[PDB]
Scaffold this active site. Structure first.
Site, PDB file in Angstrom:
ATOM      1  N   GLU A   1      -3.309   3.723  -0.856  1.00  0.00           N
ATOM      2  CA  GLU A   1      -2.421   2.480  -1.013  1.00  0.00           C
ATOM      3  C   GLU A   1      -3.231   1.359  -1.478  1.00  0.00           C
ATOM      4  O   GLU A   1      -4.237   1.115  -0.847  1.00  0.00           O
ATOM      5  CB  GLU A   1      -1.148   2.178  -0.069  1.00  0.00           C
ATOM      6  CG  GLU A   1      -0.231   1.161  -0.313  1.00  0.00           C
ATOM      7  CD  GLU A   1       0.568   0.801   0.758  1.00  0.00           C
ATOM      8  OE1 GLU A   1      -0.150   0.654   1.836  1.00  0.00           O
ATOM      9  OE2 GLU A   1       1.640   0.423   0.710  1.00  0.00           O
TER      10      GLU A   1
ATOM     11  N   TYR B   1      -0.503  -3.402  -7.599  1.00  0.00           N
ATOM     12  CA  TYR B   1       0.135  -2.586  -6.318  1.00  0.00           C
ATOM     13  C   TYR B   1       0.235  -1.018  -6.705  1.00  0.00           C
ATOM     14  O   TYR B   1       0.754  -0.950  -7.699  1.00  0.00           O
ATOM     15  CB  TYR B   1       1.268  -3.108  -5.618  1.00  0.00           C
ATOM     16  CG  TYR B   1       1.885  -2.170  -4.569  1.00  0.00           C
ATOM     17  CD1 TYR B   1       2.773  -1.260  -4.793  1.00  0.00           C
ATOM     18  CD2 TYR B   1       0.922  -2.148  -3.253  1.00  0.00           C
ATOM     19  CE1 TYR B   1       3.439  -0.746  -3.640  1.00  0.00           C
ATOM     20  CE2 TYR B   1       1.569  -1.308  -2.130  1.00  0.00           C
ATOM     21  CZ  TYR B   1       2.783  -0.416  -2.498  1.00  0.00           C
ATOM     22  OH  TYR B   1       3.089   0.392  -1.586  1.00  0.00           O
TER      23      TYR B   1
ATOM     24  N   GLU C   1       6.901  -9.470  -4.011  1.00  0.00           N
ATOM     25  CA  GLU C   1       7.093  -9.040  -2.613  1.00  0.00           C
ATOM     26  C   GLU C   1       7.766 -10.315  -1.981  1.00  0.00           C
ATOM     27  O   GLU C   1       7.033 -11.348  -2.155  1.00  0.00           O
ATOM     28  CB  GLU C   1       6.049  -8.495  -1.932  1.00  0.00           C
ATOM     29  CG  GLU C   1       6.218  -8.116  -0.661  1.00  0.00           C
ATOM     30  CD  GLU C   1       6.015  -9.162   0.585  1.00  0.00           C
ATOM     31  OE1 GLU C   1       5.827 -10.113   0.218  1.00  0.00           O
ATOM     32  OE2 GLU C   1       6.498  -8.658   1.688  1.00  0.00           O
TER      33      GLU C   1
ATOM     34  N   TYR D   1      -3.687  -2.780  -3.083  1.00  0.00           N
ATOM     35  CA  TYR D   1      -3.425  -3.997  -3.267  1.00  0.00           C
ATOM     36  C   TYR D   1      -4.448  -4.914  -4.136  1.00  0.00           C
ATOM     37  O   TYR D   1      -5.513  -5.283  -3.559  1.00  0.00           O
ATOM     38  CB  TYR D   1      -2.876  -4.998  -2.172  1.00  0.00           C
ATOM     39  CG  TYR D   1      -1.769  -4.251  -1.268  1.00  0.00           C
ATOM     40  CD1 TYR D   1      -2.191  -3.121  -0.479  1.00  0.00           C
ATOM     41  CD2 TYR D   1      -0.601  -4.651  -1.340  1.00  0.00           C
ATOM     42  CE1 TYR D   1      -1.307  -2.551   0.293  1.00  0.00           C
ATOM     43  CE2 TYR D   1       0.241  -4.028  -0.487  1.00  0.00           C
ATOM     44  CZ  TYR D   1       0.190  -2.935   0.302  1.00  0.00           C
ATOM     45  OH  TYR D   1       1.034  -2.529   1.067  1.00  0.00           O
TER      46      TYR D   1
ATOM     47  N   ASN E   1      13.449  -7.885   3.048  1.00  0.00           N
ATOM     48  CA  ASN E   1      12.052  -7.500   2.511  1.00  0.00           C
ATOM     49  C   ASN E   1      12.428  -6.657   1.227  1.00  0.00           C
ATOM     50  O   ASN E   1      13.356  -6.134   1.245  1.00  0.00           O
ATOM     51  CB  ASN E   1      11.601  -6.703   3.605  1.00  0.00           C
ATOM     52  CG  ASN E   1      10.092  -6.244   3.319  1.00  0.00           C
ATOM     53  OD1 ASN E   1       9.530  -6.735   2.383  1.00  0.00           O
ATOM     54  ND2 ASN E   1       9.508  -5.317   4.103  1.00  0.00           N
TER      55      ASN E   1
END
Length: 189
Positions: free
Chosen positions: A85, A76, A176, A87, A44
């Site tokens: 947080e 992000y 990611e 996105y 990851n």
């Protein structure tokens, strides 16, 4: 075996994190450019370039994004006071990363409808440590790999849903990957 790299390079903030350094290679290049390659369908990671602190800015990005499996391309970032947080998802592979978040409307900007989602993360890792915090998502319907993102239009859309954004922390154009493979070379400005 984890690795986390942050700093300034080419005039830009960068951040790279992985729990498998052997299957992912992150490369800082000139100005706002970076490249990432990942193989072996193991590990990851999240990495990219941008700013710290972020702001309501227009983010321009271009390059090549070639995932094979679970992966996303997103603006992000974080705010503090309150802790949020967020996105802005511009492209993704085989999994929609907003799955499980609560649907919270639509906003039309930068040539596409974005679907808005909210979620709460409870005692989860955050830039302030283990905390409960709110997440915002905008997910582009018309996937793309280059263009401009008017982040303030998203921030205003989210503020009509739930708590308004706080003071900005970092803000990056992130690639990611999750147990997948691919390559990307992106340039932010």
């Amino acid at each position: 075996r984890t690795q986390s790299s942050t700093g300034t390079h080419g005039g830009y903030y960068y951040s790279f994190w992985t729990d498998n350094p052997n299957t992912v290679t992150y490369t800082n290049q000139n100005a706002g450019q970076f490249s990432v390659s990942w193989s072996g369908n193991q590990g990851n990671f999240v990495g990219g370039k941008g700013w710290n602190p972020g702001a309501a800015r227009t983010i321009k990005y271009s390059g090549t994004y070639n995932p094979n499996g679970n992966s996303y391309l997103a603006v992000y970032g974080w705010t503090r006071n309150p802790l949020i947080e967020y996105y802005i998802v511009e492209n993704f592979g085989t999994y929609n990363p907003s799955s499980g978040a609560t649907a919270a409307g639509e906003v039309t900007v930068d040539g596409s409808v974005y679907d808005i989602y909210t979620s709460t993360r409870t005692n989860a890792p955050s830039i302030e440590g283990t905390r409960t915090f709110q997440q915002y998502w905008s997910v582009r319907r018309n996937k793309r790999s280059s263009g401009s993102v008017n982040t303030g239009a998203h921030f205003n859309a989210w503020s009509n849903v739930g708590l308004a954004l706080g003071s900005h922390d970092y803000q990056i154009l992130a690639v990611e990957g999750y147990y997948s493979s691919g390559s990307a070379t992106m340039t932010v400005s």
